[PDB]
Design a protein around this ligand. Structure first.
Ligand code: VZ6
Lengths: 175, 175
């Protein structure tokens, strides 16, 4: 349904174009930019997928143990008539007991914001109960696309709320 | 169907966020940046909608009478966890008889590229004959959204090929 189009839009528009050349940007930050004494940013992009489609624009305000650190070197590309459309990513540190536990490239999945707004607009004909299924369908289709296509550059983090920093840390430790 | 989700994604993700503050950027270029002797960039964003979903990334190569001139001051905003996600636009001149006939902010509609790629991917389950209807449906839904919501900042340019520069000029002269 709606999520299926959004999922393919996510892969074709964003993931297919920045994942193949994301590792080099992380290398460039770690070697040439990252502080000489602060470890290394992980090699994988971690994507948050709140199934309730609550996607705040500020990750740091969504968890005090998460806070912005730096940005990777931005990726530019001529896209659909725009000269040097800029694809940017933000590096975040994760705090356990007040000490930096992990640093990675972390962001939410924007199409989930699109689903949430459509449920809020009268003309979209989208319901709140419809949204929760589309949120799940969006992740499934995204998983199917990434299964058979770059690889090992993207880890999906889905969660439903009855610590987000502990949730993300939990994924970093597994690899 | 698929286009309906893409159309609302286009409005919620891009148009709702740059159209309200596009006029000021055009003012800033025209006054502080644009060459003292080259006229004024038009106040409206013109969006190309090729119904065949052929969207080249280089506008200039799609018509020799169209060629890149400059970029507007980029718009930045914290979006879905990304700090200072950059929304950029490119200014183009239109050539009639080899003399500059018009200058405006021109770009293609990216979701049409997404539709085209889905028709090319086996897992998307999207057909070429399906695409042509979805391309038309995408424009209709986009027209419906813009009808009852900013306003007079965006002109849609749809066309089917049996001069793109003459086609765009035709729209500038009407206002
Ligand atoms: N700056 C801009 N210039 C020109 N057009 C733009 C811009 N911004 C948005 N649009 C248009 O608006 C819709 C909705 O996009 P939204 O933001 O909802 O998310 C999009 C979609 F899910 C899909 C892109 O597919 P596309 O067909 O391009 O659709 C877009 C496009 F038509 C992936 C995702 N995505 C794209 N880029 C980034 C990024 O840098 N970070 C994080 N996610 C990103």
């Amino acid at each position: 349904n709606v999520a299926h189009g959004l999922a393919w839009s996510y892969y074709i528009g964003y993931l297919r174009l920045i994942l193949p050349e994301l590792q080099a940007r992380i290398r460039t930050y770690n070697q040439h930019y990252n502080n000489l004494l602060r470890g290394a940013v992980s090699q994988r992009l971690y994507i948050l997928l709140p199934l309730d489609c609550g996607v705040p624009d500020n990750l740091s305000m969504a968890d005090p143990n998460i806070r912005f650190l730096d940005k990777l070197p931005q990726q530019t590309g001529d896209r659909a008539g725009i000269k040097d459309r800029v694809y940017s990513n933000s590096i975040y540190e994760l705090l356990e007991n007040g000490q930096r536990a992990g640093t990675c490239v972390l962001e939410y999945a924007t199409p989930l914001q699109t689903l949430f707004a459509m449920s809020q607009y009268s003309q979209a004909g989208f319901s709140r109960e419809d949204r929760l299924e589309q949120a799940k369908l969006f992740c499934r289709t995204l998983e199917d696309i990434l299964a058979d296509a770059s690889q090992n550059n993207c880890r999906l983090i889905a969660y439903q709320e009855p610590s987000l920093s502990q949730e993300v840390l939990r994924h970093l430790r597994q690899e």
